[PDB]
Structures are given as C-alpha cells and as structure tokens.
C-alpha cells in the first residue's frame, strides 16, 4: 500500500495473509468470508507467465494478523488448505478478467476479537454503493512504493472512479468484471495498492445497516500511485453467482 497508514488493532479482522511454506514468504492478501472459506485473486494462485501454479500443500493462510513478519502468538491462527477453486473463465492470458478464487480451509477457524468475516454484497448494496466518488478501503502488507515493505498492515481509503476515466487511463482492455479506484491528479490526495497487495479486499461500510461489505479484490495496476493511473479491482458482486455455486457444491 502506497501513501496509507498503519491499521488500528482489529480494524480489518477479515484480513488474511497467503503464506508459502517453503521458502517461508508472503504471497498475497485474501479475506475471510466464513469460518471455512477464504476469498482471493486468482492470479495469487495461478499465473503461468511467471511460472506460478500453486497447489494446496504449498500454502498456508494466516488469519488475525497485524505484524507483517512476526509470529503473533495467541492472536493469529494458521490454517491449512483443503481445496483451491479458481474461476473457470479466469483470463490469465490477457487482462486478468474474472480474477477471483476461493480457498476452503481444512478446519474451521475460531472467531475472536481479531478474526471475523466480512459480508459479500447483495445486488442492492452493490447498486447503491458502487458509484463514482464513493470511497472504499484497501488493506495489505505489500510494497510501500513502486521502487520498502511495512512493519504492520497498511490501510488506505480511495474513491471509485468513473468508468470512462478508468478506460482512458490504460491500454489494457477493461471489462464489466472490474472497477477502478484512486484519486485524480487534480484532487491532491494520493494512495494505491502495489505489488504484494494482490488478493486483499476493497471494502465499504454500508450506511444503511452499518456493516462492512467486500466490493472488490486487489487485481492489477501499472506502477504504483502514479499520476493519471488507477488501481483495478475484481467486481465481487458480478461474480457472486459463481461464489455461491462453489460454496453450495462444496
């Protein structure tokens, strides 16, 4: 996260770290949506251009964390994966269209002050809140600048951007399964996701029922916090029917 701030304790209790067993290293962010299910970006698990194709046994998820590198004894919980599920039409060849994946945990995680699930949006919450100028919140342990890693989880609030501005900012083909967020050059304020923030959540607090909803997943960008560029996020509601099918099937 570029131009963010340190998270408060318990501020993002659905935050999940994807962790490689060997070598022990951070791979991605992710989010807790129930006691058994974790949501992330498909490119965190499968990206052939970089020879990335992880299997369950390569990975752990660490839940309830704040510190990036410390083992947070009596606070974080570490879970193994039962199964990975990637969207069947995830487009790793071109533009990361449908950049979404689910991970089922081998055993349910116990909720605590530091571990708690986020909501997934219904059609009406999405229609009401996914509007240009409305701000969401992005969290992660990724790089603090383009060219430099944080001690603790970072948080930044960013406005959703009008779709024509998103399209005109890039040569990559945008789809309805994406939205973009960030400040414009004239707006003054700054901030963005960066490498290492992949798969973390873009959340909004509904003013109707005072609950946090995950509207997006950190998906892609070109550089970090560049003027005239924006970060792109998987549109979670657009792909919710797939999410539901997987959770019901399994």
């Amino acid at each position: 996260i570029v131009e963010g701030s340190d998270a408060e304790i318990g501020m993002s209790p659905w935050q999940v770290m994807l962790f490689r067993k060997s070598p022990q290293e951070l791979l991605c962010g992710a989010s807790l949506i129930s006691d058994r299910w974790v949501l992330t970006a498909a490119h965190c698990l499968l990206y052939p251009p970089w020879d990335k194709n992880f299997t369950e046994n390569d990975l752990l998820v660490r839940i309830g964390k704040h510190s990036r590198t410390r083992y947070e004894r009596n606070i974080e919980k570490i879970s193994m994966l039962e199964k990975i599920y990637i969207h069947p039409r995830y487009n790793w060849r071109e533009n990361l269209d449908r950049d979404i994946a689910l991970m089922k945990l081998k055993k349910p995680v116990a909720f605590s002050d530091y571990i708690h699930p986020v909501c997934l949006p219904d059609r009406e919450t999405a229609a009401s809140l996914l509007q240009a100028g409305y701000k969401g919140r992005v969290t992660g342990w990724g790089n603090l600048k383009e060219t430099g890693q944080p001690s603790v989880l970072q948080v930044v609030n960013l406005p959703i951007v009008e779709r024509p501005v998103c399209k005109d900012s890039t040569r990559i083909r945008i789809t309805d399964n994406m939205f973009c967020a960030g400040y414009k050059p004239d707006e003054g304020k700054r901030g963005d996701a960066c490498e290492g923030d992949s798969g973390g959540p873009f959340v909004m607090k509904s003013p109707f029922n005072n609950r946090w909803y995950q509207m997006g997943i950190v998906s892609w960008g070109e550089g970090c916090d560049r003027d005239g560029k924006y970060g792109f996020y998987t549109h979670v509601f657009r792909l919710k029917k797939w999410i539901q099918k997987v959770i019901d099937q399994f």
Partner: peptide, 28 residues
C-alpha cells in the same frame, strides 16, 4: 454470515475507527 461485517473491537462496541467517517461522508 448472520454476524458478518460487524467488527468485535468497533461496531460490536459502538466504537468508530479513525477514518471510517471519510467513507460515510463520500456516500452522497
């Protein structure tokens, strides 16, 4: 699911975090 999105150290105690009001102010 029933309790989703309500944080133990914030919503469940009626405490606000330091920047959530910035989000609310944008929902015009």
């Amino acid at each position: 699911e029933a309790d989703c999105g309500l944080r133990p150290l914030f919503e469940k105690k009626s405490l606000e975090d330091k920047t959530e009001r910035e989000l609310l102010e944008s929902y015009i």
